Design a protein around this ligand. Structure first.
Ligand SMILES: O=P(O)(O)OCCNS(=O)(=O)c1ccc(OC(F)(F)F)cc1
Ligand SMILES: O=P(O)(O)OCCNS(=O)(=O)c1ccc(OC(F)(F)F)cc1
Ligand SMILES: *Cc1c(COP(=O)(O)O)cnc(C)c1O
Ligand SMILES: *Cc1c(COP(=O)(O)O)cnc(C)c1O
Ligand SMILES: N[C@@H](Cc1c[nH]c2ccccc12)C(=O)O
Ligand SMILES: N[C@@H](Cc1c[nH]c2ccccc12)C(=O)O
Ligand SMILES: N[C@@H](Cc1c[nH]c2ccccc12)C(=O)O
Ligand SMILES: N[C@@H](Cc1c[nH]c2ccccc12)C(=O)O
Ligand SMILES: [Cl-]
Ligand SMILES: [Cl-]
Ligand SMILES: [Cl-]
Ligand SMILES: [Cl-]
Ligand SMILES: [Cl-]
Ligand SMILES: [Cl-]
Ligand SMILES: [Cl-]
Ligand SMILES: [Cl-]
Ligand SMILES: [Cl-]
Ligand SMILES: [Cl-]
Ligand SMILES: [Cl-]
Ligand SMILES: [Cl-]
Ligand SMILES: [Cl-]
Ligand SMILES: [Cl-]
Ligand SMILES: [Cl-]
Ligand SMILES: [Cl-]
Ligand SMILES: [Cl-]
Ligand SMILES: [Cl-]
Ligand SMILES: [Cl-]
Ligand SMILES: [Cl-]
Ligand SMILES: [Cl-]
Ligand SMILES: [Cl-]
Ligand SMILES: [Cl-]
Ligand SMILES: [Cl-]
Ligand SMILES: [Cl-]
Ligand SMILES: [Cl-]
Ligand SMILES: [Cl-]
Ligand SMILES: [Cl-]
Ligand SMILES: [Cl-]
Ligand SMILES: [Cl-]
Ligand SMILES: [Cl-]
Ligand SMILES: [Cl-]
Ligand SMILES: [Cl-]
Ligand SMILES: [Cl-]
Ligand SMILES: [Cl-]
Ligand SMILES: [Cl-]
Ligand SMILES: [Cl-]
Ligand SMILES: [Cl-]
Ligand SMILES: [Cl-]
Ligand SMILES: [Cl-]
Ligand SMILES: [Cl-]
Ligand SMILES: [Cl-]
Ligand SMILES: [Cl-]
Ligand SMILES: [Cl-]
Ligand SMILES: [Cl-]
Ligand SMILES: [Cl-]
Ligand SMILES: [Cs+]
Ligand SMILES: [Cs+]
Ligand SMILES: [Cs+]
Ligand SMILES: [Cs+]
Ligand SMILES: [Cs+]
Ligand SMILES: [Cs+]
Lengths: 395, 267, 395, 267
């Protein structure tokens, strides 16, 4: 029994061991309570403004669209403290942990960004933070691991399974299964068991709310479409939520196409996977024929996960949102384009969203369209990866 | 029916059930089949058998590693079902329960999963990441195929949960020793006799205590508290892990351990 | 002959070759004109808000001052696009270049941050950008060099002299001496010949203006002191300018003490150098006994320069501002402290300012004082340097 | 007085002045002294001599490298002044002008700098990074010590600048060939006869054209346009750079070059 529907249509639910159900029920109640609590909301707003730096800019990108009938704005989550949108929801989850009387945080991370965001919120708010990270990810993300440790978090390598993000997700839940009376699990995306898809959306919805106000102020109308990449679904649902009832506004989610859909080396389960049950939810995933959870792939670590949040699968099924893919090479081109034409270095994740917008513009350059790309992160973290690819190409 | 028959016979002998867990195909198919026959010959009353899965999120490191060993041996669910058919073909009456994760059951269709369980002669299925709140299509498919759905009764169960588990379950009720995940390294720390009594009041399937059972005294303790018996997994699997280099010593130590644990069920 | 006084007291002036005087006169006129031009001001405000993300947060740091009578705020220039305050003035200088009809930018850089800021402004505003950088700096700042090149700037190693920042400064002026009809020199600090100390101050003064509004709103009074590190002087004068006439407000500038003043391995000319004439100005510098310009030193590359802007030397001489030094080890400690207690990774430059504030607090923990540190940059760029020091120490 | 005497004598011979520049102590003190004596013996009418400085921001790569060579040889300003005293002790009447940067003049006091110049027998000082706008304390100290302050007349000089340079300067007026920094690789591209005429109208010190002069035809061109002569630096220094490995060939080539350049001043 729950306060809120755990499902979006057929997708979602609460597929956790029985032992964890009280943990989820407690969290759901504390969330519903917090959402009615002016004191909670004021504390959250205070952190978002004075610590994280909200509101974020909405930047008009004139050079990149010159000589077309596209007007493109970028919502600048890359300017948020931490350099990605994740900071918004970790602040809210940290406040929920305090609300429930917990003093410890558990988090999973793959690329390391969620680990950093969890650690920073925990440092600020006086919570002990332990982060699980697949050993292969620990090996490849030394900079982020060091950042987590500077902020006083414990970083725990996970050697089980495939030693990557899904294995870290498992380990986080294993720990929580035995510690939830004292520790909160700060899940890093709008996926997993209810109530996380709901909470993460609500704690990211300021992205779309601000975008709506800013676009009305600047253009006097709503956008024709808003475009965001989809790793687990948080930045995208944060941009989308406030526009869901504005049915003239297109909602476009971009999954990583990796080396190409046809190669099987991608991270696009919503459109190219198969519904399964894993990480507490019924959702599209990448899996073997006999139902083992598969290895995902993207040039961008932030996108490299074999599933997707349930609200995206739902919005897709009813045709409210459209989902597309962008390959490594298309993302790389968009990355280089933004650097050179706008003086902004985007996250390779965000480069997927921008790449799709550039395709919308280039394919139909005489179509009048007002687009917003959610620039969810900056790309300083990616310059080594990009350097190494460009070098191998002899560019 | 196999559980009902077993519990009635054990009741007549004033005995608890001793129920080992192993991962099917750990460390390979052939040695796994020998392991399981050894467990039975040494006095196992029933079996809990895991199908190797990529993401066993209710399991501690011992059983994580068992899953990994089976994968290293190339063990697939299809091969596991071949194994199960052969196990039943060898042993007519022993209850065989599977420990599953939801995706393996859902993968080719929930109904077809339980139909295959029925065809090979499985008796119960416990899906570790499906709580009672989500159990409806699993328990329905189970019962349609004469499979007992196994429900978990946690130490912190309220009255409504006790009533649900009592009502929907068959075969046995899983009485969790403690919070956390499987492992012999963590022993349960709470008296469970109150839950056991409430389960009996509500006409639940007989209780088997599981998680952290690694010693004869814990088996005897389970029986003394009113449970119908006890499950031991990590302690069994550790013997496998320890003895990978000597299959002969492995089987010897498995025999001694199961024999001692079964001896403790007298009471 | 000039429109404005080129001197602050005895410091400053226009010590350039005769050939460059028309370039300086033109720039001064264009600046004075721009400062009266509402259209210029609106364009500048638009870039600062919608592209750079102004206004920046003012963050109250409660954990770091617990159990003392210090209240500490951080002005969050680390959240500005580019991750340092330099972005503010490069936008204004780029607009001046356009005002004068120039389509090319020349810039010097040492640490590489000014190079990045110059390149980003140039990319956005359609200007060709060439950056001079001492060859030794090019070697040690591969990440920043790559960032400049991604944004389409040319980066030109300088092999003359000591192959470091002063040599890059020289080369920039050499180029300008022969190109000023078509190119603007985007000098990177509030130093050099008039009118640069004036222009850079005015194009950074929003830091202090916002700080004043934000502190009044939050505390109902002006700060007891505002504290900023001093590399060439830009972030510090930007924080100070709006408070100069508020004589109750302390203005504290922090020079890098390096290995210690007594070792001679530092970058603290204002207090430990000797007045000289170099880089177009009469100012304190580090120099040999016979007047060769000396090698400066700091753990932080952003601070490692053997001179200082003339307005600082002036404010010091009249006793309006006080200047202090902080050593490498004190800066490192402040860096680690902020990461762990506030979840903010500061620039090692900014860590010098924070270190002095922590000393003000720790030395006199019962003194009621309201301090603002100008957190001029984020410290992601520094985590390798810090890692390597902590490792050598076996921490 | 040495400049006034030189220009009067050259006027009588209808000759231009040829004036080489070198860096003092490039490539070492002893070879530098031999270089300078060679320049004189081959027909230099006056000298421009640079004191090695860390930041020569009016100089292109050729003279940047000359400064670096002198530093590699450990040459200091004090040693340069010892050299200058010896040069004057050898050559009574040749005008000796220094090319300085402001910090070297300011370092131990402006007045003391020019006092030392007077003591060693220097005739003029050009401070490359001090424009007329900042010149007052330098020109005053110069004149107090009987040193000619050398002012730069750029190609883009307005009337006010011409009047200032004419009024404050002594010895010679430096007539810049072009924008940019020293170097033989860039030739001046503008006729300067108008500036030369205006300087004469305003009773300025005689003009020497400098920057990018590397060829006899440029010397003759300077004289034909009405200038009193021409300065050549980078072209001279390149001969040093080219011949570091053979001091004998270096001096031979310096002699041939200066001889040819001086020959061109006949007119
Ligand atoms: O002896 P241990 O501690 O290794 O425990 C044995 C466990 N083996 S099992 O198949 O009964 C079993 C039963 C339930 C499990 O998870 C769940 F409770 F969430 F459903 C996991 C494994
Ligand atoms: O032949 P080149 O092109 O090497 O030029 C020779 C220059 N040697 S110099 O001492 O006259 C000389 C004169 C003026 C200089 O700069 C200034 F104009 F800014 F003052 C620099 C050098
Ligand atoms: C984490 C991250 C993503 C992917 O995660 P979502 O939950 O799908 O948003 C995408 N972009 C950036 C910049 C991220 O930091
Ligand atoms: C560039 C820089 C400095 C030093 O330069 P100033 O002109 O003195 O401000 C200090 N801090 C940061 C973060 C910088 O980027
Ligand atoms: N791998 C990214 C984003 C992420 C965190 N948790 C996730 C769960 C599912 C999908 C993506 C994520 C990070 O750790 O920063
Ligand atoms: N600490 C014991 C007992 C316990 C406390 N709170 C619990 C909640 C659920 C289950 C058990 C417990 C355990 O984790 O098992
Ligand atoms: N070295 C720093 C700051 C800087 C730029 N120009 C300067 C001139 C003087 C002193 C410091 C600077 C950078 O390049 O980013
Ligand atoms: N291009 C030539 C002539 C010239 C054009 N504009 C100038 C301004 C100043 C001096 C010279 C010039 C030079 O640089 O010399
Ligand atoms: Cl649906
Ligand atoms: Cl449903
Ligand atoms: Cl709300
Ligand atoms: Cl609300
Ligand atoms: Cl990396
Ligand atoms: Cl590192
Ligand atoms: Cl650390
Ligand atoms: Cl392992
Ligand atoms: Cl509204
Ligand atoms: Cl409008
Ligand atoms: Cl798949
Ligand atoms: Cl299959
Ligand atoms: Cl809808
Ligand atoms: Cl394609
Ligand atoms: Cl036996
Ligand atoms: Cl088989
Ligand atoms: Cl199956
Ligand atoms: Cl139900
Ligand atoms: Cl019921
Ligand atoms: Cl556990
Ligand atoms: Cl536990
Ligand atoms: Cl109990
Ligand atoms: Cl009994
Ligand atoms: Cl003064
Ligand atoms: Cl003055
Ligand atoms: Cl103004
Ligand atoms: Cl104004
Ligand atoms: Cl580095
Ligand atoms: Cl690089
Ligand atoms: Cl590039
Ligand atoms: Cl060189
Ligand atoms: Cl005001
Ligand atoms: Cl107040
Ligand atoms: Cl010094
Ligand atoms: Cl001296
Ligand atoms: Cl004052
Ligand atoms: Cl000290
Ligand atoms: Cl001769
Ligand atoms: Cl000598
Ligand atoms: Cl001297
Ligand atoms: Cl004057
Ligand atoms: Cl005059
Ligand atoms: Cl030049
Ligand atoms: Cl030129
Ligand atoms: Cl002319
Ligand atoms: Cl003639
Ligand atoms: Cs456009
Ligand atoms: Cs994904
Ligand atoms: Cs029952
Ligand atoms: Cs305090
Ligand atoms: Cs300095
Ligand atoms: Cs004169």
């Amino acid at each position: 029994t729950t306060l809120l529907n755990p499902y979006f249509g057929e997708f979602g639910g609460m597929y956790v061991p029985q032992i964890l159900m009280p943990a989820l029920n407690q969290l759901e109640e504390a969330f519903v309570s917090a959402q009615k609590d002016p004191e909670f909301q004021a504390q959250f707003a205070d952190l978002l403004k004075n610590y994280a730096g909200r509101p974020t800019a909405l930047t008009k990108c004139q050079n990149i669209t010159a000589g077309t009938r596209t007007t493109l704005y970028l919502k600048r989550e890359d300017l948020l403290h931490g350099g990605a949108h994740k900071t918004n929801q970790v602040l809210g989850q940290a406040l929920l942990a305090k609300r429930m009387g917990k003093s410890e945080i558990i988090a999973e991370t793959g690329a390391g960004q969620h680990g950093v965001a969890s650690a920073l919120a925990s440092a600020l708010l006086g919570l002990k933070c332990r982060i699980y990270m697949g050993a292969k990810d620990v090996e490849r993300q030394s900079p982020n691991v060091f950042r987590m440790r500077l902020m006083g978090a414990e970083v725990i390598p996970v050697h089980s399974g495939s030693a990557t993000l899904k294995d870290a997700c498992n380990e986080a839940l294993r720990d929580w299964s035995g510690s939830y009376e004292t520790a909160h699990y700060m899940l890093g995306t709008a996926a997993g068991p209810h109530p996380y898809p709901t909470i993460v959306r609500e704690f990211q919805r300021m992205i779309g709310e601000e975008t709506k106000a800013q676009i009305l102020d600047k253009e006097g109308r709503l956008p024709d479409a808003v475009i965001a990449c989809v790793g687990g679904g948080s930045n995208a649902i944060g941009m989308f939520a406030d526009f869901i009832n504005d049915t003239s506004v297109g909602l476009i989610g971009v999954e990583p196409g990796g080396h190409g859909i046809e190669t099987g080396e991608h991270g696009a389960p919503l459109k190219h996977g198969r519904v399964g049950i894993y990480f507490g939810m019924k959702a599209p995933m990448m899996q073997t024929a006999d139902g083992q959870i598969e290895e995902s792939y993207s040039i961008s670590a932030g996108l490299d996960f074999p599933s997707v949040g349930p609200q995206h699968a739902y919005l897709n099924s009813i045709g409210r949102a459209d989902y597309v893919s962008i390959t490594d090479d298309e993302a790389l081109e968009a990355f280089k384009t933004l650097c050179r034409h706008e003086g902004i270095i985007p996250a390779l994740e965000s480069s997927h969203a921008l790449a799709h917008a550039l395709k919308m513009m280039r394919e139909q350059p005489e179509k009048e369209q007002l687009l917003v790309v959610n620039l969810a992160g900056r790309g300083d973290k990616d310059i080594f990866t990009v350097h190494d690819i460009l070098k191998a190409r002899g560019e | 029916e196999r559980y009902e028959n077993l519990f009635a016979q054990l009741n007549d002998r004033r005995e608890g059930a001793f129920v080992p867990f192993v991962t099917l195909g750990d460390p390979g198919i052939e040695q796994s089949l020998k392991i399981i026959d050894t467990l039975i010959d040494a006095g196992a009353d029933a079996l809990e058998l895991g199908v190797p899965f990529s993401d066993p999120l209710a399991d501690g490191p011992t059983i994580q590693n068992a899953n990994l060993r089976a994968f290293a041996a190339g063990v697939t669910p299809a091969q596991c079902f071949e194994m199960l058919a052969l196990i039943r073909e060898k042993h007519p009456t022993i209850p065989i329960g599977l420990l599953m994760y939801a995706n393996l059951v859902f993968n080719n269709g929930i109904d077809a999963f339980y139909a295959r369980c029925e065809q090979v002669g499985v008796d119960s299925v416990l899906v570790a990441d499906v709580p009672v709140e989500e159990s409806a299509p699993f328990r329905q498919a189970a019962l349609r195929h004469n499979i007992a759905p196994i429900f978990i009764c946690p130490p912190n169960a309220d009255d409504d949960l006790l009533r649900q588990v009592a009502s929907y379950g068959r075969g046995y009720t899983y009485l969790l020793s403690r919070s956390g995940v499987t492992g012999a390294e963590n022993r349960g720390a709470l008296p469970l006799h109150h839950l056991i009594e409430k389960l009996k009041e509500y006409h639940a399937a007989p209780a088997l205590q599981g998680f952290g059972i690694s010693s004869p005294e814990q088996v005897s303790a389970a029986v003394r508290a009113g449970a119908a018996g006890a499950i031991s997994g990590s302690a069994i699997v550790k013997i496998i892990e320890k003895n990978l280099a000597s299959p002969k010593q492995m089987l010897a130590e498995l025999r001694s351990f199961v024999s001692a644990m079964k001896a403790a069920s007298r009471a």
